[PDB]
Amino acid sequence: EMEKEFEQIDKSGSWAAIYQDIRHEASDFPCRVAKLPKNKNRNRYRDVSPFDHSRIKLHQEDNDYINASLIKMEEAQRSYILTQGPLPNTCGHFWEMVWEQKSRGVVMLNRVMEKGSLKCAQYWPQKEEKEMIFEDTNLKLTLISEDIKTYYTVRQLELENLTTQETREILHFHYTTWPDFGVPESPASFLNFLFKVRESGSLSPEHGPVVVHCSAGIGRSGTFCLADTCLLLMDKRKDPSSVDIKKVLLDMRKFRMGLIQTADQLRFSYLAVIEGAKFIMGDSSVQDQWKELSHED
Numbered sequence: 543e544m545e546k547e548f549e550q551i552d553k554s555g556s557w558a559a560i561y562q563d564i565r566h567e568a569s570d571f572p573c574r575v576a577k578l579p580k581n582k583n584r585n586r587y588r589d590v591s592p593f594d595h596s597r598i599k600l601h602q603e604d605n606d607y608i609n610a611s612l613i614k615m616e617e618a619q620r621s622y623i624l625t626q627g628p629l630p631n632t633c634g635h636f637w638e639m640v641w642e643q644k645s646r647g648v649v650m651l652n653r654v655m656e657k658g659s660l661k662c663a664q665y666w667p668q669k670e671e672k673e674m675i676f677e678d679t680n681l682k683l684t685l686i687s688e689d690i691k692t693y694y695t696v697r698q699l700e701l702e703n704l705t706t707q708e709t710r711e712i713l714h715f716h717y718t719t720w721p722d723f724g725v726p727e728s729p730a731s732f733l734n735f736l737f738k739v740r741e742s743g744s745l746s747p748e749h750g751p752v753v754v755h756c757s758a759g760i761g762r763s764g765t766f767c768l769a770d771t772c773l774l775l776m777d778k779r780k781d782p783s784s785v786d787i788k789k790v791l792l793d794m795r796k797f798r799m800g801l802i803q804t805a806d807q808l809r810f811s812y813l814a815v816i817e818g819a820k821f822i823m824g825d826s827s828v829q830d831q832w833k834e835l836s837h838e839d
């Protein structure tokens with residue numbers, strides 16, 4: 543039980559040390575393409591790069607690079623694409639990747655503006671009449687509708703491949719109250735949002751992998767995915783005591799660096815998994831309790 547491990551860590555005030563231990567054990571793989579000179583302007587942050595082995599390749603001939611990684615969780619049987627907040631020059635590449643990878647959902651965990659800076663480009667239309675067209679990747683993107691709640695918004699988007707006029711619906715789940723280098727307001731609010739994503743069908747294996755991003759695609763995005771995958775794991779076996787959260791985080795950091803950026807985000811990951819376990823283990827009524835606690839209307 544992770545609840546015994548939690549109270550133990552807490553009692554001894556040792557989150558920072560557990561977390562430094564993860565940082566020390568985590569995988570180091572090359573990111574040579576990330577670092578090619580040509581790719582300088584495709585990366586938001588110097589120190590955050592996809593590993594070559596798990597990077598997503600764009601299906602184009604000029605330059606196939608995007609700062610994005612495939613997190614493939616074999617045991618759990620869920621994949622995610624984690625990526626940085628698109629740059630003003632990489633929005634067509636971002637949509638190219640959603641198209642090629644056949645993703646149904648985009649989970650955005652940041653605002654465009656955070657801590658006085660622009661953390662991400664405005665890569666989707668904010669209104670129905672004003673579509674976006676990405677001339678470089680030959681894609682149009684239209685806002686079809688939005689559902690604005692208190693701390694998150696769900697949008698439906700239409701993505702058209704202008705080369706073919708094939709058309710797809712993309713759901714965008716936008717968490718707007720999760721601070722950079724911070725944590726959600728509560729396990730309930732986080733879990734309510736996670737369950738909104740899950741309910742939508744976006745995480746399903748009939749789709750390509752969900753695209754998850756924050757500003758760098760590591761802190762908030764790693765926290766989201768850790769909690770999801772830990773709950774999925776518990777689900778398949780109905781055996782919570784068999785889930786080792788630090789170990790599943792280390793499995794995830796094989797596919798992208800720096801997943802989970804603070805010790806408090808780690809601590810929050812345990813809280814969300816311990817609470818979520820209630821639902822996985824048969825108490826379906828918690829779901830509506832989280833919705834109520836979350837104050838989403």
Ligand SMILES: O=C(O)C(=O)Nc1ccc(I)cc1C(=O)O
Pocket residue numbers: 587588589590652661722723756757758759760761762763803
């Ligand atoms: O958005 C996030 O949650 C996240 O992980 N962000 C970051 C991670 C690493 C670095 I270098 C910078 C940031 C940042 O946003 O400034």
